[PDB]
Amino acid sequence: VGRLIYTAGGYFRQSLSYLEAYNPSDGTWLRLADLQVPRSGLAGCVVGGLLYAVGGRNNSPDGNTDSSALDCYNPMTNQWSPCAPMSVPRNRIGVGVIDGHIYAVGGSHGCIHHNSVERYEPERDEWHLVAPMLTRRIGVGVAVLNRLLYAVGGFDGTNRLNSAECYYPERNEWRMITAMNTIRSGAGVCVLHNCIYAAGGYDGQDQLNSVERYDVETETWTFVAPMKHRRSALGITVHQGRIYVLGGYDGHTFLDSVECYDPDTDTWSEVTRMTSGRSGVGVAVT
Amino acid sequence: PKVGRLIYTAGGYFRQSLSYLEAYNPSDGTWLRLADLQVPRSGLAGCVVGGLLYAVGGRNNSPDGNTDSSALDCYNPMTNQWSPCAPMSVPRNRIGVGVIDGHIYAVGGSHGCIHHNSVERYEPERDEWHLVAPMLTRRIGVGVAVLNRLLYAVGGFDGTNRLNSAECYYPERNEWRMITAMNTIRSGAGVCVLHNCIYAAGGYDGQDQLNSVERYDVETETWTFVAPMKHRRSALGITVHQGRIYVLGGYDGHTFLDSVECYDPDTDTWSEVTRMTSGRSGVGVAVT
């Protein structure tokens, strides 16, 4: 009954409101307080034991609009409530956390493919812009390592991206790092055991099951064991030293599968089936 | 002496965008395989001018990437040859198309994130495209019909709202004007004109694919439901042949249809009349 893998929002025929927690301990799923507004392409993070759902694209009376919302779920109360919205709608957003600050990265507002980035201070309930990325990125994967922020792949409005860049918070500046072997947008990006993994995504023609991982030591991208299902728009997180991949889109069907990567073994393996196939989820652990 | 008017289906999509050109002969019920598109495309549109067939817009399937297309290709049924013509001013995927006095009107459609409201006219005699009045709405997945030398744009998606509204284009005055709306929100519906009504069949209401079918009477400016199709389908090809509507393929939510349904106006009845060689949707359709 410790930390849970939370899934928020998503899409299946329509944008979803479901909040659901998986407990790898026993194999349980828990249905929790729904999102005040259904949303897809959002990102999930947690700080201070609070779960934040950021950005995406929501559904409404006469609204399928890109979202600049930041909503706070409090597991001890099981309540959602609104926080200060981002400066601009950021659909297909990336998120990272650094010293209890939430970085919203890239995303889109209609045709606008942001390079801008903003930082959220929860105590002050405030968003402030920072240094824009060198590339405009929507569908960008985010991973925090060594108090550095890595933004991986995406779509710049014209080209699908294999490039990745790193943000220095103290220097407040971006520097590009060496690109992946495969173009990926809408991939799942996390950080495990000092390497930044990028799994799945869409290379411009097919959704992928291959996994690339970055070693900052060698500063290079190396393939690993591919996932059993090709997927993009997948939720990702890591839990007690293993990678959990949730849902996604294989090209025809919204997957319910959840796969687990063991770095020691270099093996994937399905561990659950969610509650319904979906894609575009936000994922966090607490 | 034989083989008269045929129903051409061009392009389509089934797990990837296709390049098939197939003619259906309603009289004897047979299918002919003609010269493939030089680039496989789907979500495109088909029209005919001077006995020539035109494939317009869509999204092509190309090794380097799947780009929304701005191409216009003309096929000559007497040489079985496809030949490039002047491309449109912008890519138009999920396009709508009408013909008026031997001119092709490309209506709306998408360019990646762009939801066009603009409209352009192609003059075969010059192989040239020129923009005209933009619609009052952005429309992708829009159905287009020509009635009494006026162009009707029906349903679609404006980027944030699925549309049940339709508008009318007056070529000589060059202007758009909203008309009565449909009973159902429809994107990706089959739109055609039969016996001075504008039929809108199938599509997507934002929740499900549709089998409903409604026609607009320009005289009474009202939208009335008729016999629904027997299959739900969106992104379906449509045409009129010997006073009956033929719908081809489409996506029903799980499967890419190969069924071809025929609507008889006099009995208000649909009926499967044949199947395409393979399931598909997003085809362009024309008759000639």
* A271 strand-pairing partners: none
Minimal Cβ distance to B65: which of A63, A64, A204: A204
Contacts B164 to A, Cβ<8 Å = none
CA dihedral A230, A232, A237, A241 (to 10 degrees): 30
Q: How far is A61 from chain B (nearest CA, A)?
A: 9
CB of B247 within 8 A of CB of B263? yes
| B158, closest residue in chain A (CA to CA) | A64
Quick one: how many helices (H) and strands (E) in chain A?
Answer: 0, 28
Tell me the count of A-B CB pairs closer than 8 A. Answer: 27
Q: How far apart are CA A202 and CA A183, in angstroms?
A: 8
Resolution (A): 3.0
B113/A160 Cβ within 8 A: no
| A138, closest residue in chain B (CA to CA) | B113
Please, which residues have CB within 8 angstroms of residue B242's CB and are 6 or more apart in sequence?
A: B5, B26
Minimal Cβ distance to A111: which of B15, B113, B161: B113
Determination technique for this entry: X-ray
Q: How far apart are CA B229 and CA B189, in angstroms?
A: 12
Q: Given phi > 0 = left and psi -120 to 50 = alpha, else beta, which region is B97?
A: beta
Please, which residues have CB within 8 angstroms of residue A64's CB and are 6 or more apart in sequence?
A: A15, A57, A58, B159, B160, B161
Q: For the purposes of burial, counting CB atoms within 10 Å of the CB of B70, is it exposed (0-12), middle (13-18) or buried (19 or more)?
A: buried
CB of B277 within 8 A of CB of B31? yes
> Which of B176, B213, B170, B216 is closest to B193 using CA atoms?
B216
Q: How far apart are CA A191 and CA B14, in angstroms?
A: 37
**Token representation of residue B12:** 């389509």
B15/A251 Cβ within 8 A: yes
Residues in chain A: 286
Q: How far apart are CA B137 and CA B140, in angstroms?
A: 10
Report how far apart the first and last C-alpha atoms of chain B are (Å, whole number): 16
Report how far apart the first and last C-alpha atoms of chain A are (Å, whole number): 10
| A253, closest residue in chain B (CA to CA) | B254
Q: How far is A203 from chain B (nearest CA, A)?
A: 9
B66/A204 Cβ within 8 A: yes
CB of A20 within 8 A of CB of A32? yes
Q: How far apart are CA A222 and CA A123, in angstroms?
A: 39
Q: How far apart are CA B183 and CA B215, in angstroms?
A: 10
Q: How far is A232 from chain B (nearest CA, A)?
A: 16
Q: How far is A111 from chain B (nearest CA, A)?
A: 6
CB of A108 within 8 A of CB of A91? yes
Residues of B engaging A, defined by a Cβ cutoff of 8 Å:
15, 63-66, 112-114, 159-161, 206-207
Q: Walk me through the domains of chain B, giving residue ranges and CATH numbers.
A: 7-287 (2.120.10.80)
Give me the residue label for tokens 């509204």: B165
Contacts B66 to A, Cβ<8 Å = 204-205
B113/A65 Cβ within 8 A: no
Contacts B112 to A, Cβ<8 Å = 157
Give me the residue label for tokens 């007497």: B78
B15/A110 Cβ within 8 A: no
| Amino acid identity, position B13 | Y
> Which of B152, B119, B120 is closest to B138 using CA atoms?
B119
Minimal Cβ distance to A205: which of B65, B112, B161: B65
Residues of A engaging B, defined by a Cβ cutoff of 8 Å:
13-14, 62-65, 108, 110-111, 157, 160, 204-205, 251-252
What b/e readout covers A208-229, taking b as 16+ CB neighbours within 10 angstroms? bbbbbbbebeeeebeebbebeb
Best residue in B13, B160, B255 for a mutation probing chain A (most A CBs within 10 Å): B160
| Amino acid identity, position B205 | D
Minimal Cβ distance to B114: which of A14, A62, A111: A111
* DSSP, residue by residue, B34-81: EPPPSS-EES-EEEEETTEEEEE--EE-BTTB-PBP--EEEEETTTTE
